Ligand SMILES: CCCCCCCCCCCCCCCCCC(=O)OC[C@H](COP(=O)([O-])OCC(O)COP(=O)([O-])OC[C@@H](COC(=O)CCCCCCCCCCCCCCCCC)OC(=O)CCCCCCCCCCCCCCCCC)OC(=O)CCCCCCCCCCCCCCCCC
Ligand SMILES: CCCCCCCCCCCCCCCCCC(=O)OC[C@H](COP(=O)([O-])OCC(O)COP(=O)([O-])OC[C@@H](COC(=O)CCCCCCCCCCCCCCCCC)OC(=O)CCCCCCCCCCCCCCCCC)OC(=O)CCCCCCCCCCCCCCCCC
Ligand SMILES: CCCCCCCCCCCCCCCCCC(=O)OC[C@H](COP(=O)([O-])OCC(O)COP(=O)([O-])OC[C@@H](COC(=O)CCCCCCCCCCCCCCCCC)OC(=O)CCCCCCCCCCCCCCCCC)OC(=O)CCCCCCCCCCCCCCCCC
C-alpha cells in the first residue's frame with residue numbers, strides 16, 4: 001500500500017466544509033436582518049399606538065367632559 | 066439489430082420538453098404580471114401629477130393674480 | 131476526536147473487506163499498490179464512456195421514435211408497459227410543475243396590482259425578502 | 260422535419276462508426292444484438308461501483324489525512340503540488356462565496372431598516388419580486 | 389399475529405414482492421410529502437391573509 | 451433478521467449432529483434462485499417482479515406523487 005499520489009477525497013471534504021461555512025455566514029446575516037426588521041416593525045406599531053392615544057386624548061379634551 | 070426493449074432516451078427527451086414547457090408557462094405568467102405592475106405604477110404617477118396640478122391650481126386661485 | 135476517527139476507519143475497512151466482489155477487490159488492490167484512487171478513476175471512465183456514447187444515444191432515440199411511430203410498440207403492449215407509462219406520466223407532470231415554479235421564480239402565483247392582497251405585500255415584515 | 264431528422268441520424272451514425280475503440284464498439288454491438296441501451300447500462304454500472312466504493316473513499320480519506328498530518332506530503336513538495344493547491348484554494352473561495360449567497364438567499368446583502376436605501380424597497384415596481 | 393411472510397433484508401429487496409413494492413411507494417409518498425410542505429409553507433412569496441384578524445376559529449368556539 | 455417489527459422466520463433444525471455430518475451437499479441440484487444460500491439474505495438472488503424497476507424508483511414515484519398532490523393547486527388553481 002504505497003503513499004497516496006492524490007488527495008481527491010480530502011479536497012472534496014474541504015469543498016463541502018467551505019460551502020457549509022459560507023451557508024452558515026449567509027444564514028447568520030439573514031437572521032440578524034430579520035431580527036432587526038422585527039424590532040423595527042414593533043417600534044412602528046408602538047409609535048402608531050402612541051399617536052392614536054394622543055389623538056384620542058385631544059378628542060377627549062375637545063369633548064370637554 | 067433487434068427492436069429496442071426500453072425507451073429511455075425518448076423518455077429523457079420528453080422529461081426535458083415537459084420541464085421546458087413548464088418554464089415557458091411560468092415565464093409568461095411572470096411577464097404578464099410585470100407588465101400589469103408597470104402599467105399600475107404609470108397610472109399612479111399620472112394620478113400624482115394630476116393631484117399636484119390640482120393643488121397648484123388651487124394655490125394659484127388663492128394667489129388671486 | 132481521534133478514537134472516533136479510528137473507529138470509523140476500522141468499520142469502513144471491515145465493510146470494504148467484507149464485500150465478495152472479485153472486480154471491486156481487484157481494482158482496490160491494484161489502486162492501493164499504485165497509490166491511486168479507484169473511485170476517481172471509475173468516475174473518469176464513466177464520463178469518457180458517456181462522452182463516446184452521445185451519438186449512440188441519438189441513434190437509439192431515433193430508433194425508438196421509429197419503433198413507437200410504426201405502431202410495433204403498441205402491438206406487443208402489456209401490463210408492464212402500462213406501469214412504465216404511468217411512471218413516465220407522473221414524472222412528466224411533476225417536471226412540468228417544477229418548471230412552472232422555476233419559470234415564475236415563485237412558489238405561488240404573483241399578486242396582481244388590482245388584487246386586494248396587495249396590502250399583504252405592503253405589510254411585509256422584511257421587505258428584502 | 261423528416262429530412263433534418265434523417266440527416267442528424269446519418270451524421271450520428273457516421274460519427275459512431277468512426278470511433279476506433281474496441282471496447283465501445285463491442286459494447287454497442289452486444290447491446291444492439293440484445294436490443295438494450297449501452298449508455299443506461301454504463302450509468303447503472305458506475306452507480307453500483309460508486310455505491311460499493313463509499314467505504315473505500317472513507318478509508319482513502321483517512322489515509323490521506325494521515326499522510327498530510329505526518330508531514331510526508333510536504334517533504335516531497337514540488338511546483339506541481341503548488342499548482343494543485345492554488346486550484347484547491349480558488350475552488351474553496353468560490354464555494355464559500357456561493358454558500359454565503361445561498362445562505363442569505365440573496366445576491367446582495369439585505370438592507371437594514373435604518374438604512375436610507377429602504378425607500379428603494381418601498382418603490383419596487385413589482386412588490387411580488 | 390405477525391407469524392411470517394416475505395421480509396426484505398434491505399431496501400434494495402423491496403422490489404422482489406408486489407406488496408412490498410406498494411409499501412415502499414407509500415413510504416415514499418409519506419416521507420416526501422414533508423419536504424413538499426417545507427418548500428410550500430416556508431416560501432418567500434407566501435403572504436399571510438390581510439383579513440386574518442377579521443375572524444378566527446378562536447372567537448367562534450369561544 | 452428484522453424489518454421494523456417484521457421478523458424473518460427461521461426453520462428449526464430437525465437432524466442431529468451425527469446424522470447432519472453425514473449429509474452430502476450438492477448445490478448443482480439446487481435452483482439457480484437459491485445458490486450459496488444465506489439465512490441472513492435468502493432473497494439476494496431472487497428475481498425482480500418487474501425488470502429494471504428498482505426499489506428507489508418506486509420510492510421516488512411515491513415522492514413525486516406527494517409533490518403533485520401538494521403542488522398541483524399552485525399551478526392550476528380552481529375557484530370555490
Ligand atoms: C441564487 C442563485 C445563486 C447562483 C450562484 C452561482 C452558482 C454557480 C455558478 C458557477 C460558479 C463557478 C463554478 C464553481 C463550481 C464549484 C463546484 C465544483 O466544480 O465541484 C467539483 C468538485 C470536485 O472537482 P475536482 O476536485 O476536480 O474532482 C476531481 C474528480 O473528478 C473527483 O471525482 P469523484 O469520483 O470524487 O467524483 C465525486 C465528486 C464529484 O461530485 C460532484 O461533482 C458533486 C457536484 C458538483 C457541484 C457542486 C456545487 C456545490 C455548490 C453549492 C451547493 C449547491 C447544491 C449542490 C447539490 C449537489 C447534489 C449532489 O463528489 C464530490 O465532490 C463530493 C463532495 C461531497 C463530500 C461529502 C463529504 C461530507 C463529509 C462530512 C463529515 C462531517 C464530520 C463531522 C465530525 C465532527 C466531529 C466533532 O466538487 C465539489 O467542489 C463538491 C462541492 C459540494 C458542496 C456541497 C454543499 C452542500 C451544502 C452544505 C451541506 C448542508 C447539508 C448537510 C449538513 C450536514 C451537517 C454538517
Ligand atoms: C475547439 C475550440 C477550443 C477553444 C478555442 C478558443 C476559445 C474559443 C471561444 C469559445 C470557447 C468556448 C468554450 C470552450 C469549450 C468548453 C466545452 C468543452 O470543450 O468541454 C469539453 C469537456 C470535456 O473535456 P475534457 O478535457 O476531456 O474533460 C474531461 C472531463 O471533463 C473530466 O475532467 P476532470 O478530470 O478535470 O474533472 C473535474 C471535475 C470537476 O467537474 C465539475 O465541477 C463539473 C462542472 C460543474 C459545473 C461548474 C460550472 C461550469 C461552467 C458553467 C459556466 C460557463 C461559462 C462560459 C461558457 C462559454 C461558452 C461559449 O469533474 C468531476 O468531478 C465531474 C463532474 C460531476 C458533477 C456533475 C454535476 C454538476 C452540477 C453543477 C451544480 C451547479 C449548477 C449551477 C446552479 C447551482 C445552484 C445551487 O466536456 C465537458 O465536460 C463539458 C461539460 C459542460 C458543458 C457546458 C459548458 C458551457 C457551454 C460550453 C459551450 C461550448 C461551445 C463550443 C462550440 C464549438 C463548435 C465547433
Ligand atoms: C424555488 C424552489 C423550487 C423547488 C421545487 C422542487 C425541487 C425538486 C424537489 C424534488 C421533487 C420530486 C422529484 C422529482 C425528480 C424529477 C427529476 C428526475 O428524477 O430525473 C430523473 C430522470 C431520469 O430518470 P429515469 O427515467 O429513471 O432514468 C433511467 C436511467 O437512470 C437513465 O440513465 P441515463 O444513463 O440516461 O442517465 C442520464 C440521464 C439522467 O440524468 C439525470 O438524472 C439528470 C438530472 C436529474 C434531475 C433533473 C431535475 C430537473 C428539474 C428542473 C430543472 C432544474 C435544473 C436541473 C439542472 C440539471 C443539470 C444537469 O439524463 C437525462 O435524464 C437527460 C435529460 C435531458 C435530455 C436532453 C435532450 C434535449 C434534446 C432537445 C432537442 C430539441 C430539438 C428541437 C427541434 C425542433 C424542430 C422544429 O431524468 C429527468 O427527468 C431529466 C429532466 C431534465 C430536465 C431539464 C430541464 C431544464 C430546463 C429547460 C431547458 C432550458 C434551457 C435549454 C433550452 C433550449 C431550447 C429548447
Ligand SMILES: CCCCCCCCCCCCCCCCCC(=O)OC[C@H](COP(=O)([O-])OCC(O)COP(=O)([O-])OC[C@@H](COC(=O)CCCCCCCCCCCCCCCCC)OC(=O)CCCCCCCCCCCCCCCCC)OC(=O)CCCCCCCCCCCCCCCCC
Nearest residue numbers: 306398399400415419420423503504505506507509510513
Ligand atoms: C433498510 C430500510 C429501508 C426503508 C424501509 C422503510 C422505511 C424505514 C425508514 C427509512 C427510510 C429511508 C428512505 C428509503 C431509502 C432511500 C435510499 C436508498 O435506500 O436508496 C437505494 C439506492 C440504491 O439501491 P437501489 O434500490 O438498487 O437503487 C439503485 C439506483 O438508485 C438506480 O435506480 P434506478 O435504476 O431506478 O434509477 C432511477 C433514476 C432516478 O434517480 C434520480 O433521479 C436521482 C434522484 C434525484 C432527485 C429526486 C428526488 C429524491 C428525493 C428527495 C427528497 C426525499 C424525501 C424523503 C426522504 C425520506 C428519508 C427518510 O436514477 C438516475 O437516473 C440516476 C440519478 C442521477 C442524477 C443525480 C442528480 C439528481 C439531482 C436532483 C434534482 C433535484 C434537486 C432538488 C432541487 C432542484 C431545484 C431545481 O440508493 C440511491 O441510489 C439513492 C441515493 C440517495 C440516498 C438518500 C435518499 C434520501 C434520504 C434517504 C434516507 C435513508 C435512511 C435509511 C435509514 C437506515 C438507517 C441505517
Ligand SMILES: CCCCCCCCCCCCCCCCCC(=O)OC[C@H](COP(=O)([O-])OCC[N+](C)(C)C)OC(=O)CCCCCCCCCCCCCCCCC
Nearest residue numbers: 216219220223406409410413508515516518519520522523
Ligand atoms: C385526442 C386525444 C388527446 C389526449 C390528450 C391527453 C392529455 C393528458 C395530459 C396529462 C394528464 C395527466 C393526468 C394525471 C395527473 C393528474 C394530476 C391531478 O389532477 O392532481 C390533482 C390531485 C390533487 O387534487 P387537489 O388539488 O384537490 O388536492 C390538493 C389537496 N390539498 C390542498 C389538501 C393538498 O393530485 C393527486 O391526487 C395526485 C395523486 C397521484 C397521481 C399519480 C398516480 C400514479 C399511480 C400511483 C398508484 C399506483 C402505484 C403502484 C405501485 C406498486 C405496483 C406494484
Ligand SMILES: CCCCCCCC/C=C\CCCCCCCC(=O)O[C@H](COC(=O)CCCCCCC/C=C/CCCCCCCC)COP(=O)(O)OCCN
Nearest residue numbers: 088089091092095099229231232233234235361385387388
Ligand atoms: C439556486 C439557483 C437554482 C438554479 C435553478 C435555475 C432554474 C431556472 C429555470 C428558468 C430559467 C428561465 C427564466 C426566465 C426568466 C428569467 C428572468 C431573470 O433574469 O430573472 C432574474 C434572475 O436572473 C438571473 O439572475 C439569472 C440570469 C441568467 C443566468 C445564467 C446562468 C449561467 C448560464 C451560463 C451559460 C453558458 C453557455 C451555455 C449555452 C446554453 C444555451 C445554448 C430575476 O428577475 P427579477 O428578480 O424579477 O429582477 C431583478 C432586478 N429587479
Ligand SMILES: CCCCCCCC/C=C\CCCCCCCC(=O)O[C@H](COC(=O)CCCCCCC/C=C/CCCCCCCC)COP(=O)(O)OCCN
Nearest residue numbers: 023027259361362364423426427428430431432433434435
Ligand atoms: C431552485 C432550488 C435550488 C436549490 C439550492 C438550495 C441551496 C440551499 C442552501 C442553504 C439551505 C439552508 C438555508 C437556511 C435558512 C432557511 C430559512 C427559510 O426557511 O427560508 C425559506 C427557504 O426555505 C425553503 O423554502 C426550503 C426549506 C427546506 C427545504 C428542504 C429541501 C429538501 C429536504 C429533503 C429532506 C429529506 C430527508 C433527508 C435527510 C438528510 C439529513 C439527515 C425562504 O423563506 P424566507 O424568505 O426565509 O421567509 C419565509 C417566511 N415568509
